[PDB]
Amino acid sequence: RPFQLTHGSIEHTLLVPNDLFFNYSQLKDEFIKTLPEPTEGFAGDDEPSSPAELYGKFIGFISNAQFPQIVELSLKDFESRFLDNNNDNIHSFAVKLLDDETYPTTIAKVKENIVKNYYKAVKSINKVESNLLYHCKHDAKLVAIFGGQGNTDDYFEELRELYTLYQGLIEDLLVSIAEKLNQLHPSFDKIYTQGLNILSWLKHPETTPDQDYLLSVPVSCPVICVIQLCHYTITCKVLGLTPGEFRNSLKWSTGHSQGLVTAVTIAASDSWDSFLKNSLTAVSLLLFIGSRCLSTYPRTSLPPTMLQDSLDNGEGRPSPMLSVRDLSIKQVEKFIEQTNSHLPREKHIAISLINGARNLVLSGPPESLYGFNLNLRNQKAPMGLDQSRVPFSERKLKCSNRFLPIFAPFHSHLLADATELILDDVKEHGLSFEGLKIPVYDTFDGSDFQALKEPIIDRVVKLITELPVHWEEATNHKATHILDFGPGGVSGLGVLTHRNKEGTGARIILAGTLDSNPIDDEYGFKHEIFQTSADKAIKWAPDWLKELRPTLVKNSEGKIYVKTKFSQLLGRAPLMVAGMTPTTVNTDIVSASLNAGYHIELAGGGYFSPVMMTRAIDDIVSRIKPGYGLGINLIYVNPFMLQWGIPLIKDLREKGYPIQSLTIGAGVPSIEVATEYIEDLGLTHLGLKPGSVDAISQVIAIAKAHPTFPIVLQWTGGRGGGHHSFEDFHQPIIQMYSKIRRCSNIVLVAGSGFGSDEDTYPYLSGYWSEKFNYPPMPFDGVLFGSRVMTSKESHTSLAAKKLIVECKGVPDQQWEQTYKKPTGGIITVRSEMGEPIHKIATRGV
Amino acid sequence: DSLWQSEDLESVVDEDVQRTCILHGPVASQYTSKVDEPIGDILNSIHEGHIARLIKEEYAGDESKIPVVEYFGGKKPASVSATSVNIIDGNQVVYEIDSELPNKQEWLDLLAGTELNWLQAFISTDRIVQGSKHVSNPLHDILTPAKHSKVTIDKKTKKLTAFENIKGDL
């Protein structure tokens, strides 16, 4: 007889067995009286808002009642009704519940009372799943990374909610860990009297002291280790895999400043008792490190004046760490020695840790670091200064420097004296690690812990305190999937190590939080690790070395072409010719080149009436091979050109001429103007070249509104054009490339100073970001404007062609000093409108 | 209007280049060393340069490994990606239609198939050249799904045949 649970406006119907409807009903009488009254759309945090959530609260309420033979039958009914062929993949079902429109989109009503009750009522999960994801060794590789100290401010509620939902998978673990913690507590009194009892704090939230005490290194070190241990144990337990054999699925593992202890402990574990023993030894070491790093360098009272002035300048609360962003290492090291020239060696500021080319953290006493950032604020420029109007070569350095949530000056000379005491504690207890199995890459040297003459713990204590962090040298990965079990979630190490590996084939899967999915899907979440599908269980990252790498093709007549994401639309070389008002108005430069098989667009500035355009287009079409098409380069600054050209293109397309592309010149139009361009007048792609970061945002907005029509971006970096919008050729796109590629219909080509294969190949392949320490960043095509002027087809005077030939070039990094002298015979001059113009340096110019 | 004088030097005063202004790029100028050469040959130089490097970086100097396609282009810059489930062909294929399985785009792709062949190009293309005159593809209009019709592409896409039940007869 069917059983129907009702609450508010939602009901769930399930087919229960007959001779249980009596005792299955008694639970129902006890279930309705424990839930809140409905209020304006099921908005209560404890209130169900979906049939699955309502039945999950039913299956979790029946667990506290001592009445078996129904709990497992209800679990099986839930799995059959809601988890089709993924009965052990509830993480995917929970996050798919978000996509439903009936359920109000929020993570609070999904994660708990569905996943909490499921694993509270589940039986033993010792069931090996479809673990074929790593069975293909040459195609998939797993690397576990471990976060460090200060990835987030309030890390404690991470472990709070992990115990709140995963009590059944960590209950025997955290009690055992805290027992050793409290056994080792009394030897280090008088420095933190407020206790170190995690169990009492979690069970009774009122027993937990303030976060000023909690965030301290001596307290947070054992707690962060417990966090990553619980995350790894949950990872091994949800799939029902022994940690010793789940470690077999991993190629190698390493950790952050603090996470290296977990990274090396992760391979000393074989069985559940062995892993528990190794975790017990690890959590003891972190107590010693926290205690002696606080007693060796106790942080004293800081005057309210300096912290107030630091907060008023947009920084954080002053800390032993100063994070400076957006500057190279050679600049940071240059500035820190200048800063320390006024400081002794006891307050010296030296490179502590390197999160990337443009994100470093320096170490020292808080007054020394505030003296450093006082200087940096003197050297820097505001965010709202609008750097676009002054040339890039002579703008001011931009940075955002602030202090991290850590209470110990790690990775500097300051703790170098503590290490000798620290290792003494290692000798004072049974702190020892057995044979390593998976390679662990050194944080400083990058080598393996297996080939060590010295032990492990006594060297990692030297590494955390004294040796600097060359973070990318440690994570020189050869793998596809990277799993972070540590703190922070979105605010931690995972995202900033994803930014360093965006296109190197590394797929970042966040095991800390489960609130998928992000709008861009840069990184995965907890569900991806536990997916049991054969080939659908693995989400692959953008591998821009192979994915957007060019390929080739052969023709039936025996000739060879290039296969790219611009050539394929063109059906020809991925090498276009930009529209130039002097140059590309000749019928012969467009017609006699299309016959060869290359793409050129005609610039409308050389024509002034629609009849002239029509007479030119007709002449080009009459002589090109029948079937090819041509583009039109329009200009946005003059409304007259627009108003006599847009009507022309519409009715010429209605007639059916080979008019194929519309490159809008300087000035990206609005969404409404570009709207009819895309829809009404019927082109294949729209050339919509911007000249600034705001313009690139505007064109991305134009691309979102029309997620069907190709849009060739044609971003010129103002290095070789006529009306060169003076900007760097790299920075405006180095920060927004992976904001452009979130588009099914975006095309990205680059110009501004391309003349040959050698200088264009790096941009197509993507290796142009090597000099800027970024992943491969491929371009769809490259446009050529200044290198085709000396062509035979161009009607530019032969004498000017010669003058250009004996006119030499300019190395890239010097192009912007063309405002003073004839740099390679080319200077910038003001136009009548104020736009800068590149012109061959001549007597007239 | 100081842009045309470089183009037409014979008009200006005494055909003096130094009096006129030529717009050119400081970064691309060193690449411009040859004068009065075909633009086709320039873009060639670049194209076969990319050929050579892209071969000698992963193809190990072998052009056989290259994935030759029949016609290069058509359905989007990316490799042709329709609804992959409905991207199918076969030797003996008949496509019965009802109200359950019509939809314009997916029907067109289903008729197109998998291989980049003459039929796939003919159906999928959004434009037909009429003596150097790009117009709309008529297959899109004439191959619209209709109730109780039937499309047969038997013998590995040698020919497509669309039937409809005229006067109650297919």
Ligand SMILES: Cc1cc2nc3c(=O)[nH]c(=O)nc-3n(C[C@H](O)[C@H](O)[C@H](O)COP(=O)(O)O)c2cc1C
């Ligand atoms: C002589 C000349 C005229 C140009 N005219 C235009 C133009 O009218 N509209 C436009 O958007 N870009 C114009 N450009 C810039 C090109 O479209 C292209 O963006 C630029 O040349 C960058 O490529 P390059 O470094 O090889 O020259 C012109 C460039 C040159 C050299």
